[PDB]
């Protein structure tokens, strides 16, 4: 059917961290790769050390679930977004909020930072997404066009610069300056809750309960289907070397080969002691900056840190 996939080692659990008191809904690593940040449904934001998993600090500003966190490469700033409809900008030199972005009409669902300019994009449940200039507290643009809660937003430097996936099953590629849709992709059958961009291949993938799909920029033409993860997929995350992690809401995670669509591992983890098997779920993934380890943020209040297996070989774990 195609060339045979490259050999990809397996990944194995090596750390479990438990201190949150509600679902961990978001996770993000610092660009200098010494710490990471989780935001959770107990309304705190926790800063943990990436080497020893120690709790550095815990910030309690929000009013309801923290649903998106991101950390800024061009400043000591951290952007958070929650279900109280409010987006905050934390300053990491004081550990205090310094700015608050007003305007959304229902829960904010997630947010992204532009890699070059000083703009911020947030998607929400009023079926719209908004562009904020970092310093001016009022949306320079409100991208509208979706007919249901926008579940995900990603933004890149090349064109198009904004890809939003929502719950009316559609994906929309926007022009930032005109603030208008250039394309609507409607191959998905059920809601789109995860999209990801390949770091150096002008490609991007979009996950849905039917199957992950792969499309090509800047026009959004279908490439190849990735099928097998029959579950509400909450996260897609891609590695510098073509590993793609699809983490679903029934708790299972699948590792695939980005190129040939080959599902090369299935993890099915175990919930924490006091919890019901009905509360196993994966809400976010993240590789670190070395792309050596992979952090998972779960619906049983744990962070689970995976590592790569050195003791495997192609003959030990052969490729189907």
């Amino acid at each position: 059917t195609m060339p045979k996939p490259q050999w990809h080692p397996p990944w194995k659990l090596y750390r479990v961290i438990s201190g949150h008191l509600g679902w961990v809904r978001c996770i993000a690593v610092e660009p200098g790769n010494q710490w990471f940040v989780t935001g959770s449904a107990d309304r705190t934001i926790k800063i943990w050390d990436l080497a020893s998993g120690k709790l550095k600090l815990s910030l309690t500003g929000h009013i309801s679930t923290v649903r998106g966190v991101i950390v800024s490469t061009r400043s000591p700033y951290l952007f958070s977004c929650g279900e109280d409809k409010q987006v905050k900008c934390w300053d990491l030199e004081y550990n205090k909020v310094i700015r608050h972005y007003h305007g959304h009409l229902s829960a904010v669902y997630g947010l992204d930072l532009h890699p070059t300019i000083d703009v911020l994009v947030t998607c929400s449940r009023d079926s719209t997404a908004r562009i904020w200039d970092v310093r001016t507290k009022a949306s320079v643009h409100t991208l509208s066009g979706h007919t249901n809660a926008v579940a995900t937003v990603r933004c890149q430097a090349a064109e198009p610069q904004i890809i939003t996936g929502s719950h009316d099953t559609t994906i929309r590629l926007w022009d930032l300056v005109a603030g208008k849709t250039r394309v609507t992709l409607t191959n998905h059958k059920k809601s789109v809750r995860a999209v990801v961009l390949h770091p150096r291949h002008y490609t991007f993938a979009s996950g849905s309960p039917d199957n992950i799909k792969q499309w090509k920029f800047p026009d959004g033409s279908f490439i190849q289907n990735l099928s097998g993860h029959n579950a509400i997929i909450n996260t897609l995350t891609v590695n510098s070397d073509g590993v793609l992690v699809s983490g679903a809401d029934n708790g299972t995670m699948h590792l695939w080969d980005w190129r040939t669509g080959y599902n090369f591992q299935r993890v099915h983890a175990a919930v924490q002691p006091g919890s019901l098997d009905s509360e196993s779920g994966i809400f976010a993934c993240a590789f670190d900056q070395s792309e050596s380890r992979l952090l998972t943020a779960e619906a049983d209040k744990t962070i689970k840190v995976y590592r790569e297996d050195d003791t495997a070989t192609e003959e030990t774990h052969p490729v189907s």
């Binding site: 195609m2 430097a157 090349a158 610069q161």
Partner: peptide, 25 residues
């Protein structure tokens, strides 16, 4: 296609063009 068909076909736009778009935008 379902392959690694043309790697430079897929390759990303380049610094000059993305910086012109960066400044224009």
């Amino acid at each position: 296609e379902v392959m690694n068909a043309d790697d430079p076909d897929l390759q990303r736009p380049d610094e000059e063009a993305i910086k012109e778009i960066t400044e224009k935008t």
